[PDB]
Symmetry: C3
Subunit: 552 residues, 3 copies
């Protein structure tokens, strides 16, 4: 319990002393570190970002003189609405109509709205274009043309084109002072666009005076290539963008506004979609006991102040999350070099690639790395068997069911014989499937008999048992007794169990000798000749030999 | 230095040829990859997202005719304020009061505000409800009821209920054209909701014409199940939501507005919390040398245009961060299969689980995988000792202090004897704690004597030294000499150092034979019988035997 | 193909039974888990956050009485603009000017704008400060001073200071009711700041009544330490911040507003930058056939309602991304303990650190862990050679080109001789560079001769070949024959190939004996004495000895 949680597991590793792999690893590590640092610093991913809340206060300055003969002056109480926040309006043109009473009168002829006769007109129809209700009559607007008769404020001048050139062109010489107060409430920071010690006699310039909050309207239009004289005729919408890219860290504090301009209304608006910008405003006051009204259609530019931006401040959680996101990228060197080792250890490299390209020859050392790095094993299953023929240099793995066919004729995968422990070695008639002649028929049941139908060689020749090594290793009683006493020093050498143990040790001795690996010697199957020679050397009394058994 | 940084470390691995584990690994890999790809594509986590900046320009079209007998017409200069941005107001009802002068007069009787007598009223009290100052008198408002006397604009009509049905119901037939210009300044993209080639004679429909920016107000109310006729009596607030879900990538560019509607005022507002929407506006003009005023309480619907949304564009840093965040999820297959291997290699599986369920039987192969994967080691500490009794099949680890008690009676953990290197083996009176009789008392100091008080067996019987293997392996002088000359071929076989080396080699020979692992043979303790037989075979001259020493 | 994808690779590990390392691992795991959980819960990183869309409806209540003698009352139609959204204005002071006609008249003397003579004035100059056009004359404004003569609305009172104390001070006793409707459209949630069952007779207090949406203006000023009486003289801008920190999860639902106040205009604005807040508004109506105008300069406080906040709701993708970002932090225990193992296994620890500090002594066990964890290997390259001198206890690695110099005099890195497999061992004239006398000159070509110019010892003495172990291991014909028949039991012992194999086995036998590791024995170079003794024991017929060959 306690000893199970008081454990630490660490990976077994191979440390390769390689110039190429070391330099590749360090180059990849430096590349990953450089990119991660660059992404962290350029994007400021260690910071929490917060949008601002903004308040705008505008002040327009400028007066204009207009003739018609009546000479008048327009000041901020004339061309400017009480709007002093995000939007302000400057009038650049106007149309006047005095003395309007709600009564029947002909509509203004605009865009060919002339009425030929009462048939061309329609009674009881609401007309938003003329802002009246047609009575179905056709009275002459003028001595030449006739228009529909509407009940509305009269006289009506709807559809009259705006004066050209614009009357209040001098509005391009007006200036606006903009005061912008911004706040980041999450970061608990506030600031404004006008600081103490700032020059007040300046006007904004994108290069000379980029922080002066006083803007000449004509300069605003000239900056983005717009014609104030042309826009003044019908009006439009212009946007003054204030951008706050604010760094709220003490060591890199920077919170200044950036001013830009952008036309917000479509220059190519369809004629039916009301191009430009205007509004009709009226003063109402009855006279002679009759409701009167004076109407002015004012054209001008609406200015929208768009204030946006974010403020960033160092946050530990953001940095931790970013570092955790980038941590897995430092396995790139491992992935790349392991891919190099695995790829160049394949046999297809030496067979096909190396003869073609001799530059790839010194990279055959990856087979050594692969065999010092990976240990291939197979699943121990009931059908797993290993055979080895003395007339062959390799070993066969049979990993399929035997459907009565003898194990001799069954084919399997070719696996190589592992190299032995040379450190220790440095010390001082016959059946149809039998190609050696010493094999004997199996005494196992029929359905299992094919398991024991194996020969020591695939081709006719001498038997493995004929060699002196078979007697020295497998059949030597003294060697087997010493091996058995190594494990159990005080073993009782009496009874029939000693012969059973001796048979087991002879089988193992043979499996170890022919199948070097203990993983393969466990599932190795002895040929009939060796098996029956062993059983003739150590016979059992009153029983039947069990044969190979599954070690799991 | 340079050779220390020019190294590469790679993990040692075991490659298991398993159908089950391979298919599980690939299924888990595919599941993780599928979910990661789905999360990346559906949420567009490879994109940087930016909120928009918006500009709105509205145009209301519609005229109404109202009787009272005076017949009048209302156009955009009557029912519409100069607001043409995010909000516009449409008047649906009104109350009129002409000829107001600042003087004493009775308050309007509303919600039972009748005054019984001067006691019920109060002098010198500001009354925001009646918008006046009470003088403490109680004059009759009418021939029947009496109300408090206030100094304010007179005549006063505060508290008068709005007309029902609403006078300007026809405002439901009005239309509004909305022009919306949006910008993503970080992505440097701009667009508008009206494009060239768009039909202008349409009206918005959620299915037939979902991109027409012309909205009929009654249709707006009908879309969300609101009654324009009922809302028109007292007014309200309606929101036109413009949503921009914009994809700014070239291969998947899509930036269109989506229009929705939502009532913004509470339908069930408390009567004291001013339900509906209205405002009082007045025209001031003196007459007869006295300040006069005409007041209109206008009820109507305020429309708030709410424009919101984000624009996304592909960003390499976002993709890198997301991929780094998802990289660690590809260790799921390793975690799961390692848990399977570790869990099924426990002995509790075979003892308890396998007899109950026979389907779990073929999964006993995880013990082989575990023993081919993990190598358990223990911390080398001064109290670490190993003992092995010839009458027992296992080994005992003593990992605690000996408080004078003999090592024979001290209990320890049962560890198994590791399998030997069978590849190499295939070649050609007595003390009270002594159960064999050949043990001798220790000559070490008392406080350390208990270290050497160990017997070869826990039960009475034959001694380990009696076996011939003890003479062949431990006591054979020729074997020890050959072993010593293996390490040092030109060793000088003279002096008393040769006997010391021979004793050391005999101890090691015995430890290796009984404790197969070199990790366990280092801390193994020889029993007294073997130790003293060795020391009688190779005695030392003029000294005391040091005994077991800590190899670290 | 199919058997290549049906594989699973698992890491080989060492399980250390250590109290220190286990407790360190679990402490680090718990620390990482605790911090990750705290960061997830405190920052709610499992949630998708969305900004709100807001609608504001304000209602101001309050009336004031002002003397001048004319006694008047101001209600919401007097001091309040039709603004009922994010901003509303309350008038706190005013200046009046009646009967204005567009004509020539002297400018008001403000800030020393007196005109000494016509020289001091200028003709044809637009003056935004006085809102007129100077005609270049100098007429007396009063009997004492003279000012410039401008064509504008007359009489002009520009530059007149605001009345002190403020006329509408009682506006501090006014109240505003704020209705705020907020929506999260991505989360499909909507709410408002007034809920059913909320008291209506309350007023806001930051502690007693923090959810009452009725605010007294004087209380707003007192909360942030502002003086309403002083601000009322010239006006200002105040911000009512509504903050919505809304949790939209069912188990932790919380969506309430938080109210704060902040002055939005600069208290220390420069006199030339228009401090305070005011606007000039005029009523136009002609009289006596002449255009007249009444102008009022109104000073007051503009209130900006700033509504901001985010709503968060549980999102599975956010949680998955956060967990993936934090997953790599659980390798901290592995990194730390591996660093501990690697650091304390260095030899500099025992040589320098341990003698100084005896507390670091029990931590010398990390050498055992390091050698059970890491296997150092080197790149097999053509210049890789190993030598071992019998008069030395170590082995020399030569990893550089031999430029004709004999291998005996070439220096290399000192590598230690690995420990043998003691489990198996427990069983039963001369050239100038020759220091033993049995070496012979090499028969290889000159450019390669230096490869074979190696001696068995660096100092004069006995030769390695003189030992009996050389005959038993290397020169024993029977041992070599048994070793050869171990690999090939049916080998044909005929021809000259048997002597070649015997020479190869003798070289290997010697390399294994002197260079224990097979990785080092492959590149080991035999000294001339041993090589020529072997070749005299097994000479070849009609050929030249090839010598050492690169095994790759
Ligand atoms: N690897 C392997 N083991 C074998 C083979 N034949 C028998 N054995 C082992 O020998 C034991 C059976 O011995 P057996 O001849 O039946 O003696 P018995 O049990 O006394 O009749 C089993 O435990 C098997 O593991 C073989 O061909 N290959
Ligand atoms: N593993 C193990 N080693 C032992 C034991 N007894 C002695 N040794 C080793 O034998 C050496 C001491 O030999 P010793 O009998 O004192 O000979 P002396 O030094 O000449 O007196 C030490 O280095 C020990 O490592 C034992 O019971 N177990
Ligand atoms: N490791 C090692 N191998 C050697 C050395 N000398 C010879 N060999 C091996 O012995 C083989 C050459 O044997 P050689 O004496 O030329 O016999 P020959 O080919 O019949 O002339 C090569 O495959 C070498 O690998 C040596 O000094 N060190
Ligand atoms: C995931 C990448 C796998 C690449 C394996 C390529 C083949 C390696 C063996 C040889 O050839
Ligand atoms: C990723 C490493 C790929 C190396 C190139 C592949 C060349 C194969 C060599 C053999 O075949
Ligand atoms: C990456 C390409 C590596 C070179 C291609 C194989 C040549 C060698 O091997
Ligand atoms: C990324 C670099 C890939 C280099 C592959 C070849 C380098 C190993 C040498 C062999 O060939
Ligand atoms: C973290 C998961 C650990 C699970 C271990 C369960 C027990 C495995 C050994 C047997 O039983
Ligand atoms: C995670 C794998 C859990 C496998 C089920 C546990 C069954 C235990 C078998 C034994 O005991
Ligand atoms: C997951 C459950 C696995 C099956 C439970 C144990 C049965 C076997 O072992
Ligand atoms: C997730 C799949 C878990 C499968 C556990 C059992 C599969 C291995 C075979 C045994 O039993
Ligand atoms: C990355 C950290 C590397 C630290 C290695 C310090 C030296 C270890 C060997 C000893 O000393
Ligand atoms: C990170 C572990 C550092 C341990 C302290 C270093 C002490 C060195 C010991 C030797 O030298
Ligand atoms: C961290 C400091 C560890 C102690 C410094 C070395 C002392 C021992 O070793
Ligand atoms: C972080 C803890 C570091 C501890 C280092 C020393 C602990 C191992 C024992 C030795 O010394
Ligand atoms: C449209 C307009 O009136 N623009 C005038 C320009 O004519 C004049 O030259 C300039 C200098 O004062 O001021 C501005
Ligand atoms: C640079 C440019 O084209 N400016 C034009 C100007 O030529 C034209 O007279 C005026 C009339 O609207 O509009 C502007
Ligand atoms: C409230 C109102 O006037 N609604 C009218 C409706 O009565 C009329 O049928 C329809 C057709 O023009 O136009 C709209
Ligand atoms: C569908 C529905 O209920 N419509 C009602 C209508 O019946 C009612 O006459 C009118 C008066 O406000 O209000 C609306
Ligand atoms: C606390 C405080 O200083 N209040 C001042 C008050 O003393 C002063 O009379 C008034 C005039 O503006 O302004 C405020
Ligand atoms: Zn046969
Ligand atoms: Zn045979
Ligand atoms: Zn005893
Ligand atoms: Zn004994
Ligand atoms: Zn020599
Ligand atoms: Zn020599």
């Amino acid at each position: 319990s306690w000893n199970d949680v008081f454990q630490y597991e660490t990976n077994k590793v191979t440390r390769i002393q390689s110039v190429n792999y070391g330099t590749i690893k360090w180059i990849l590590h430096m590349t990953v570190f450089s990119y991660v640092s660059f992404a962290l610093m350029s994007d400021k991913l260690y910071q929490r970002k917060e949008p601002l809340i903004s308040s705008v206060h505008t002040k327009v300055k400028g007066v204009a003189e207009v003739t018609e003969l009546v000479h008048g002056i327009f000041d901020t109480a004339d061309y400017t609405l009480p709007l002093q926040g995000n939007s302000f309006f400057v009038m650049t043109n106007y149309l006047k109509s005095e003395g309007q009473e709600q009564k029947l009168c002909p509509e203004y002829p605009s865009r060919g709205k002339q009425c030929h006769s009462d048939q061309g007109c329609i009674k009881g129809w609401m007309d938003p274009q003329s802002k009246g209700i047609q009575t179905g009559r056709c009275i002459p607007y003028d001595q030449k043309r006739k228009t529909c008769e509407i009940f509305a404020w009269c006289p009506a001048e709807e559809g009259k084109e705006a004066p050209r050139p614009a009357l209040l062109r001098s509005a391009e010489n007006f200036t606006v002072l903009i005061k912008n107060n911004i706040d980041f409430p999450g970061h608990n920071y506030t600031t404004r666009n006008i600081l103490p010690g700032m020059n007040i006699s300046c006007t904004f310039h994108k290069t000379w005076n980029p922080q002066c909050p006083i803007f000449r309207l004509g300069d605003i239009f000239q900056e983005i290539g717009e014609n104030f004289t042309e826009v003044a005729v019908q009006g439009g919408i212009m946007g003054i963008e204030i951008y706050w890219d604010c760094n709220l860290d003490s060591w890199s504090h920077r919170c200044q506004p950036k001013y830009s301009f952008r036309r917000l209304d479509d220059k190519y608006t369809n004629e039916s979609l009301f191009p430009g910008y205007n509004f009709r405003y009226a003063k109402y006051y009855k006279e002679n006991g009759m409701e009167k009204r004076t109407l002015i259609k004012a054209f001008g530019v609406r200015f929208d102040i768009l204030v946006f931006g974010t403020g960033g401040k160092f946050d530990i959680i953001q940095l931790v999350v970013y570092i955790g996101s980038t941590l897995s990228y430092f396995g790139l060197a491992t992935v790349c070099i392991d891919l190099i080792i695995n790829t160049y250890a394949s046999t297809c490299c030496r067979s096909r690639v190396y003869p073609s390209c001799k530059c790839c020859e010194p990279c055959a050392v990856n087979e050594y790395y692969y065999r010092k790095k990976c240990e291939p094993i197979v699943e121990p299953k009931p059908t797993l068997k290993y055979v080895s023929f003395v007339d062959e240099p390799h070993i066969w793995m049979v990993d399929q069911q035997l459907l009565g066919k003898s194990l001799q004729d069954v084919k399997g995968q070719e696996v190589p014989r592992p190299q032995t422990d040379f450190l220790e070695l440095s010390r001082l008639d016959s059946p149809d499937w039998c190609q050696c002649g010493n094999c004997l028929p199996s005494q196992l049941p029929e359905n299992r008999r094919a398991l024991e139908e194996l020969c020591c060689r695939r081709k006719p020749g001498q038997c493995i048992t004929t060699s002196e090594l078979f007697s020295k290793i497998v059949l030597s009683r003294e060697a087997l007794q010493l091996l058995l006493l190594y494990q159990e020093p005080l073993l009782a050498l009496e009874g029939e169990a000693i012969n059973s143990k001796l048979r087991h040790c002879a089988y193992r001795s043979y499996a170890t000798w022919r199948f070097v690996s203990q993983d393969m010697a466990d599932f190795a199957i002895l040929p009939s000749c060796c098996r029956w020679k062993i059983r003739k050397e150590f016979p059992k009394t009153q029983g039947q030999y069990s044969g190979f058994k599954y070690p799991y």
